[PDB]
Ligand binder design. Structure first.
Ligand code: 3NI
Ligand code: 3NI
Ligand code: 3NI
Ligand code: 3NI
Ligand code: 3NI
Ligand code: 3NI
Lengths: 117, 117, 117, 117, 117, 117
C-alpha cells in the first residue's frame, strides 16, 4: 500500500477511517456546542480525506488491469465510494457516513475475492 | 480540488510534478554519485506521489458520472496514468517519466473539453 | 522546486492555490450556513498555506542573488504576497484573495523574465 | 483515534504498517540493487513511523489510568513496541520487524481485553 | 528526535507549541467573532497535536529504560501531559493550556537532569 | 508562528532542526555503512526542510515592514540562511551544517532586538 510495492493491503484502513467519520456525525447530533461542532467538522474532514486516500491507493496500486475487467463495476464502485466520502465531509447526517461504509463493504468483498483467486 | 468544493481544478498540478519526476530521472542518468543518487531517489518518490494524488483528485472529485459516460475510456486512462507514475518511482529511466507525462497529456485534453462543454 | 535541485519551477503552483483561496471566499459570500462556513474556513486555511509555501520556495530556491540585484523590489514583493495570503486566511472578503493574486501576478512576470536572460 | 474523541480505535492500524515494515525487510534481503535498497529504506522508514504514531495514539488517547492500573506492564510494553519499530527502521533484518509485531500482538490482546470489561 | 538517531532533543519543541495553544485560548476570550473562533479552534487543534507529537518522541525515542528506572513516575507524567494537551484541544479555557505547560515543565526538568548525568 | 496569529515565535525552532542537520553530518563522516548513509541522507533532508520552513515563517509572518526597514540586510540574511540549508541537504560535510547555524544565529539576534523594541 506504500508503492514499493510491499504486497500488504487491507480495505480495513479505509474502513476504520470511514467508521470514525460516521461516529463523529453521530456525536455531532448530541452536542450543539459551537466549539465542539467546529472541532468535529475539522476532524471529520481529516478522517474522510484519509479514507479517500486509502481507497485511492487500492484503486491505483492494488487492483490491476485484469481486476477491472473481471469486475466491470469496480471503477464505478470505487469512484462512488470516494464521492460518498466527499458527501460525508459536507454533511452531519450519519446516513452519509453509512453510505460510504456500504460502498467500502462492496469493495472489501471484491478485494478478498481477488486475494483468494 | 480541495473538496469544499472550490470549483478550481487544473491538470497542471499533476503535470508539473510529473515534469519534476522526469527531470530528476535525467539528472540521475548524468551523476552516479552515491549521495546524489540517494537524494534524487528520495525526492523523485515524493514528487511522483504528489502527481498521483493530483490525478486521483481529478478522478474522484472533478470528473462526474456524465463525464465517464461520455468518455468510456476515462477510468482506465487515469488508472494507467497513476500506475505509470508508480513505475516511474521504481525507475531511473526518463522514458518512464515521459510515459506518465503522455498519459497526463491525454487526461489534460479530456479535462479541458469537459470545461468548454 | 523540490530542492534536489530538479530545475523545474512554475509560479502556477502558487497561483492555482491562491485562486482556490479566492474562489472559496466568493462561495462564502453566498452561504451563511454554519457548517459550510466552518468547512470553507478550514479548507481556505489549508490552500492559503500551500500558496505561501510555493512562494517561499520560489524565493528561497529559484531566485538567486543576481535576481535580487536586477529586481531590488523582489524581496519586498514576495514578502507582501505571502503576507497578503495570511490576510486572506483571516478574511472572507474576496478582495483579500484578489490582492494576493495581484502580487503573485507581479512575481510571475518577474519569474518569466528571469527565465529569458 | 482522532482525538475528538470519536471512540473508534483498533490496533490493526499499527499492525498493518508493521506488517509492511517486515515485508519490506524480507524483500530487501533478496534484492541487493542499489536503487531498490534506497526506495525500500525510504518507504520502510515511513511505514515504521506511521506504526509508531498509531501506537502512541493508543497509549496517549485510548488507554486511561484505570487501564495502566490493571496492566502495570502496559507503559513498558508500548514503549518497547515503539522502540522495536525504531530498531526496525535501522535494520534490514526481518527479525526486527517481527519483534515489533510480537509486541503489537500483546498490545492488541490487552486492547481487546479492555473492550470486554 | 528524528529517529536516525541524531542525538539531538529539546523539550522546548513541545513547550513552544504548548505556549501557542495557551496564547490562542487567551485570545479566544477577547474576540467572539465567528470566523476568528473557527480559525482559533482549527489552529489550536494543530499546535496541540504537534506538542503531543514532540512529547511522544521524547517518551519513545529519548527516554530509555535507565531513565524510567531512575524516574518511576515518568511514564505517568508524559501520559498525563499528552492527555492535558487533548483536554486543551477540547477547551477555550487558558487553564487547560496552562496545565499542559506545567507538565511539560516537569518533563523538561527531568530531561536536563538526565542530560547532565 | 501558526498564522492565527498567535504571537508566539522563536528562532529556536529553526536552530534545533539545524543542529540535528549538523549532528547527522558528523555521524555520516564516521560511519560509511551504506544503509546508514541512506537513512542519514533521508532524515537530514527532512530536518533541513523543517529548518527552512521555520525560517520562512519568521520571514513571512513574524518580521513586519518596519523590521525590514530597520534592518535592510534581513531579507538577504534569511535568504542566505535557507540557501545554506539547501546546501547542507546536498552535503555530508558538517561545515555546511555549521554555516547554516551561523546564519540562524545572526537572525536570532535581530529577532530578539525587534522583540525588545
Ligand atoms: Ni505498501
Ligand atoms: Ni478544491
Ligand atoms: Ni524541485
Ligand atoms: Ni478518533
Ligand atoms: Ni532526531
Ligand atoms: Ni503561531
Amino acid at each position: 500500500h506504500c508503492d514499493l510495492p510491499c504486497g500488504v493491503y487491507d480495505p480495513a484502513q479505509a474502513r476504520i477511517e470511514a467508521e470514525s467519520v460516521k461516529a463523529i456525525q453521530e456525536k455531532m447530533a448530541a452536542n450543539d456546542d459551537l466549539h465542539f461542532q467546529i472541532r468535529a467538522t475539522v476532524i471529520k474532514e481529516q478522517r474522510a480525506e484519509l479514507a479517500k486516500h486509502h481507497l485511492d491507493v487500492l484503486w491505483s496500486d492494488y487492483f490491476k488491469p485484469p481486476h477491472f475487467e473481471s469486475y466491470p463495476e469496480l471503477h464505478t464502485l470505487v469512484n462512488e465510494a470516494v464521492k460518498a466520502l466527499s458527501a460525508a465531509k459536507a454533511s452531519t447526517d450519519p446516513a452519509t457516513g453509512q453510505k460510504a461504509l456500504d460502498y467500502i463493504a462492496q469493495i472489501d468483498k471484491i478485494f478478498w475475492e481477488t486475494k483468494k483467486a
